[PDB]
Structure formats: structure tokens, C-alpha cells
Design an enzyme around this catalytic site. Structure first.
Site, PDB file in Angstrom:
ATOM      1  N   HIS A  30       0.821  -1.163   0.000  1.00 50.85           N
ATOM      2  CA  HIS A  30       0.000   0.000   0.000  1.00 50.85           C
ATOM      3  C   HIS A  30       0.874   1.237   0.000  1.00 50.85           C
ATOM      4  O   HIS A  30       2.016   1.223   0.470  1.00 50.85           O
ATOM      5  CB  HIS A  30      -0.814  -0.055   1.281  1.00 50.85           C
TER       6      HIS A  30
ATOM      7  N   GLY B 138       0.029  -5.781   1.836  1.00 51.43           N
ATOM      8  CA  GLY B 138      -1.132  -5.847   0.965  1.00 51.43           C
ATOM      9  C   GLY B 138      -0.926  -6.696  -0.289  1.00 51.43           C
ATOM     10  O   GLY B 138      -1.895  -7.278  -0.768  1.00 51.43           O
TER      11      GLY B 138
ATOM     12  N   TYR C 113      -5.122  -4.211  10.718  1.00 54.68           N
ATOM     13  CA  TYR C 113      -5.748  -4.727   9.509  1.00 54.68           C
ATOM     14  C   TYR C 113      -7.251  -4.919   9.623  1.00 54.68           C
ATOM     15  O   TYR C 113      -7.923  -4.539  10.581  1.00 54.68           O
ATOM     16  CB  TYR C 113      -5.179  -6.107   9.182  1.00 54.68           C
TER      17      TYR C 113
HETATM   18  C1  LIG Z   1       0.166  -3.768   6.132  1.00 53.85           C
HETATM   19  C2  LIG Z   1       0.795  -2.979   5.017  1.00 53.85           C
HETATM   20  C3  LIG Z   1       1.466  -1.774   5.590  1.00 53.85           C
HETATM   21  S1  LIG Z   1       1.505  -0.313   4.589  1.00 53.85           S
HETATM   22  C4  LIG Z   1       2.903  -0.658   3.809  1.00 53.85           C
HETATM   23  C5  LIG Z   1       3.673  -1.920   3.714  1.00 53.85           C
HETATM   24  N1  LIG Z   1       4.849  -1.835   2.988  1.00 53.85           N
HETATM   25  C6  LIG Z   1       5.957  -2.414   3.587  1.00 53.85           C
HETATM   26  O1  LIG Z   1       5.953  -2.979   4.670  1.00 53.85           O
HETATM   27  C7  LIG Z   1       7.177  -2.290   2.665  1.00 53.85           C
HETATM   28  C8  LIG Z   1       7.987  -1.053   3.021  1.00 53.85           C
HETATM   29  N2  LIG Z   1       8.845  -0.691   1.963  1.00 53.85           N
HETATM   30  C9  LIG Z   1      10.131  -1.317   2.055  1.00 53.85           C
HETATM   31  O2  LIG Z   1      10.425  -2.222   2.832  1.00 53.85           O
HETATM   32  C10 LIG Z   1      11.138  -0.980   0.991  1.00 53.85           C
HETATM   33  O3  LIG Z   1      10.710   0.256   0.370  1.00 53.85           O
HETATM   34  C11 LIG Z   1      11.394  -2.070  -0.059  1.00 53.85           C
HETATM   35  C12 LIG Z   1      11.822  -3.393   0.581  1.00 53.85           C
HETATM   36  C13 LIG Z   1      10.149  -2.305  -0.949  1.00 53.85           C
HETATM   37  C14 LIG Z   1      12.591  -1.551  -0.840  1.00 53.85           C
HETATM   38  O4  LIG Z   1      13.746  -1.372  -0.005  1.00 53.85           O
HETATM   39  P1  LIG Z   1      14.750  -0.530  -0.855  1.00 53.85           P
HETATM   40  O5  LIG Z   1      16.042  -0.304  -0.043  1.00 53.85           O
HETATM   41  O6  LIG Z   1      15.109  -1.332  -2.119  1.00 53.85           O
HETATM   42  O7  LIG Z   1      14.105   0.836  -1.232  1.00 53.85           O
HETATM   43  P2  LIG Z   1      13.922   2.102  -0.358  1.00 53.85           P
HETATM   44  O8  LIG Z   1      13.855   1.765   1.158  1.00 53.85           O
HETATM   45  O9  LIG Z   1      15.109   3.057  -0.626  1.00 53.85           O
HETATM   46  O10 LIG Z   1      12.677   2.847  -0.744  1.00 53.85           O
HETATM   47  C15 LIG Z   1      12.779   3.523  -1.933  1.00 53.85           C
HETATM   48  C16 LIG Z   1      11.589   4.355  -2.106  1.00 53.85           C
HETATM   49  O11 LIG Z   1      10.322   3.576  -2.010  1.00 53.85           O
HETATM   50  C17 LIG Z   1       9.449   4.179  -1.043  1.00 53.85           C
HETATM   51  N3  LIG Z   1       8.594   3.354  -0.532  1.00 53.85           N
HETATM   52  C18 LIG Z   1       8.813   2.029  -0.256  1.00 53.85           C
HETATM   53  N4  LIG Z   1       7.715   1.392   0.113  1.00 53.85           N
HETATM   54  C19 LIG Z   1       6.698   2.340   0.083  1.00 53.85           C
HETATM   55  C20 LIG Z   1       5.282   2.277   0.358  1.00 53.85           C
HETATM   56  N5  LIG Z   1       4.645   1.170   0.729  1.00 53.85           N
HETATM   57  N6  LIG Z   1       4.560   3.409   0.235  1.00 53.85           N
HETATM   58  C21 LIG Z   1       5.183   4.499  -0.143  1.00 53.85           C
HETATM   59  N7  LIG Z   1       6.461   4.704  -0.424  1.00 53.85           N
HETATM   60  C22 LIG Z   1       7.213   3.555  -0.293  1.00 53.85           C
HETATM   61  C23 LIG Z   1      10.484   4.821  -0.121  1.00 53.85           C
HETATM   62  O12 LIG Z   1       9.789   5.783   0.726  1.00 53.85           O
HETATM   63  C24 LIG Z   1      11.343   5.559  -1.125  1.00 53.85           C
HETATM   64  O13 LIG Z   1      11.032   6.873  -1.573  1.00 53.85           O
HETATM   65  P3  LIG Z   1      12.094   7.952  -1.376  1.00 53.85           P
HETATM   66  O14 LIG Z   1      13.489   7.282  -1.287  1.00 53.85           O
HETATM   67  O15 LIG Z   1      12.000   8.884  -2.583  1.00 53.85           O
HETATM   68  O16 LIG Z   1      11.801   8.754  -0.100  1.00 53.85           O
HETATM   69  C25 LIG Z   1      -0.197  -2.919   3.939  1.00 53.85           C
HETATM   70  O17 LIG Z   1      -1.574  -2.337   4.068  1.00 53.85           O
HETATM   71  O18 LIG Z   1       0.122  -3.193   2.820  1.00 53.85           O
END
Ligand SMILES: C[C@H](CSCCNC(=O)CCNC(=O)[C@H](O)C(C)(C)COP(=O)(O)OP(=O)(O)OC[C@H]1O[C@@H](n2cnc3c(N)ncnc32)[C@H](O)[C@@H]1OP(=O)(O)O)C(=O)O
EC number: 4.1.1.-
Length: 261
Positions: free
Chosen positions: A66, A110, A140
Site C-alpha cells: 500500500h 497488501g 488490519y
Molecule cells: C500492512 C501494510 C502496511 S503499509 C505498507 C507496507 N509496505 C511495507 O511494509 C514495505 C515497506 N517498503 C520497504 O520495505 C522498501 O521500500 C522495499 C523493501 C520495498 C525496498 O527497499 P529498498 O532499499 O530497495 O528501497 P527504499 O527503502 O530506498 O525505498 C525507496 C523508495 O520507495 C518508497 N517506498 C517504499 N515502500 C513504500 C510504500 N509502501 N509506500 C510508499 N512509499 C514507499 C520509499 O519511501 C522511497 O522513496 P524515497 O526514497 O523517494 O523517499 C499494507 O496495508 O500493505
């Protein structure tokens, strides 16, 4: 047709939807979700037998989940009825065709529930998966939670959710989450062949069973009271302080500090 966020492709009676949101890592934004829904809607035709969800080859990340920014501020319910995730999942489920998920790279939150909601799941030996509501302090929803309780044991799902750590494919397989696990190089073919084969079969039969199966996995009910009760707790986690601190930490890309309130 042509879509902005997605890329459809037909091979015989096998349609293949490819996510085209590389900039946002394939995060689940309304915009995206919407296109995904338009592309499916479109593909609902007699000529189309089997569908396939996929991320562009080479992908490091299937979907990051998400889009936080799209998350609620703390005015309503984030995980509402008409919330992007709810729709596509309900959609995928009630979809009269089989929907396979060919997974490459990592799946988050998600995404996991979304692909969980599909009929089959083939994956690259390298993908990893992880349920993460806890890392941000998210309460959730019931339905979302339910959809994760149809393959793996409770203890397992609990471990998944609880630690919010990522599991490998090999493990996710062994626990009965995915159907198959292949080597990257073989991922597409394998998935294809399977979709072609399944498409050799009586579409009308399949549609009904998939509907029976769906009708069954939802056969879990409870009283008026009980719902509001959980809903209450749900509300209460929103208005929480730990909540806010949850988003922040992330936005500020800093390790959070949960208090218990
Ligand atoms: C329950 C659940 C919770 S809500 C969200 C759940 N999502 C997560 O748990 C995943 C969280 N995201 C991450 O772990 C990571 O971004 C990952 C593993 C996808 C990539 O790691 P990475 O080192 O390769 O990349 P990164 O950490 O530099 O992130 C790069 C860019 O992606 C963004 N970014 C990553 N994930 C998200 C997201 N879900 N929503 C919005 N922005 C996001 C970072 O803010 C950033 O923008 P900037 O660098 O420009 O600032 C759900 O409803 O889905």
C-alpha cells in the site's frame, strides 16, 4: 487495449497482466489498482480462459504494498469497504477465470494478501514474502486477515504477521502457501504451460467450482455485537499514538518506538 499503469498480453486464450508502476515500486495506489481492475474487467471474455499477474522480468520487488501517503490520516477507516485493496481482492475472487500469480522479487503486506487471494501462485526461487501490518502499527481488517488463513496453519500465519519478517519461497512452499517454486530462468515458461493446460479445460466447470470454493472459504460468521466490538478496537488503534508514530518513523525513515498507546 492500452493502459497506463498496466500492460496486457494475449497468447492464445491466456491473458497476462504486467504491472507497469516501476517508479512507485508497484505500490498499491488507487490509480494503479484502478487500472488493474480495468484490465481485468476488460479481459472478462469468453476467449480468455486463464489470467496471469506478473511484474516485469528482472524485478527486484514485486510490490511494496500500500502507498503509505495514501493511508488515512486518522479520520476514518483506512481498510474501508471501498478501499483499493478490498476491491481488487473481492474482484479477483469473484473473477470467473483462474488467476495465477507468477512472483518475482519481494512481496509486501497488501501484495501478499492480494496474491494470497488468487488461485495459484508460482514463484522464483528467490522471491521472499512478508506480512507487515505490525511494523507500522496497523490494525488490519477482518476480511484481509481471513484471506490469509486458508492455506497455512494458524501458528504459521501468526508467526508471519507477528514478527513481520520475510520468508523465502522454499519455506512459503513447504508451509503450503505457493503452488510451485522455480528457477528464474524457468519461471515464465512453466507458468505459461500451466496456464495453457488449464485452459484446455471446461471453462464452465471451473467457474463454478471456483465459486463454490469461494462460497466455502467465507463460510466463517459471527453476530452483530462481535463485529462492532472488533471494529471498536480497530477504531481505537487508529486514533492511537503508536499509530501515528508508525507512519512517521517510516516517512522519516527511522526506527519506530511503540509505547502501548
Ligand atoms: C500492512 C501494510 C502496511 S503499509 C505498507 C507496507 N509496505 C511495507 O511494509 C514495505 C515497506 N517498503 C520497504 O520495505 C522498501 O521500500 C522495499 C523493501 C520495498 C525496498 O527497499 P529498498 O532499499 O530497495 O528501497 P527504499 O527503502 O530506498 O525505498 C525507496 C523508495 O520507495 C518508497 N517506498 C517504499 N515502500 C513504500 C510504500 N509502501 N509506500 C510508499 N512509499 C514507499 C520509499 O519511501 C522511497 O522513496 P524515497 O526514497 O523517494 O523517499 C499494507 O496495508 O500493505
Amino acid at each position: 487495449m492500452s493502459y497506463q499503469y498496466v500492460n496486457v498480453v494475449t497468447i492464445n486464450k491466456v491473458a497476462v497482466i504486467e504491472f507497469n508502476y516501476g517508479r512507485k515500486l508497484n505500490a498499491l495506489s488507487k490509480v494503479f489498482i484502478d487500472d488493474l481492475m480495468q484490465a481485468l474487467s476488460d479481459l472478462n471474455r469468453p476467449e480468455i480462459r486463464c489470467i496471469i499477474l506478473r511484474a516485469p522480468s528482472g524485478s527486484k520487488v514485486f510490490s511494496a504494498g500500500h502507498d503509505i501517503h495514501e493511508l488515512p490520516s486518522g479520520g476514518r477507516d483506512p481498510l474501508s469497504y471501498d478501499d483499493p485493496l478490498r476491491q481488487i481482492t473481492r474482484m479477483i475472487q469473484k473473477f470467473p477465470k483462474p488467476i495465477i500469480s507468477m512472483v518475482e522479487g519481494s512481496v509486501w503486506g497488501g501484495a501478499f494478501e492480494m496474491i494470497m487471494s488468487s488461485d495459484l501462485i508460482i514463484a522464483a526461487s528467490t522471491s521472499t514474502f512478508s506480512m507487515t501490518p505490525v511494523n507500522l502499527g496497523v490494525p488490519y481488517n477482518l476480511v484481509g486477515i481471513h484471506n490469509l488463513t486458508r492455506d497455512a496453519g494458524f501458528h504459521i500465519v501468526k508467526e508471519l504477521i507477528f514478527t513481520a519478517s520475510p520468508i523465502t519461497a522454499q519455506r512459503a512452499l513447504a508451509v503450503g502457501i505457493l503452488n510451485h517454486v522455480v528457477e528464474v530462468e524457468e519461471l515464465e515458461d512453466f507458468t505459461l504451460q500451466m496456464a495453457h493446460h488449464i485452459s484446455e479445460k471446461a471453462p464452465l466447470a471451473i467457474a463454478v467450482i471456483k465459486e463454490e470454493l469461494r462460497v466455502l472459504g467465507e463460510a466463517h460468521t459471527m453476530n452483530s455485537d462481535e463485529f462492532e466490538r472488533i471494529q471498536g478496537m480497530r477504531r481505537a488503534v487508529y486514533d492511537s499514538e503508536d499509530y501515528q508514530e508508525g507512519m512517521n518513523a517510516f516517512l522519516e525513515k527511522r526506527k519506530p518506538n511503540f509505547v502501548g498507546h
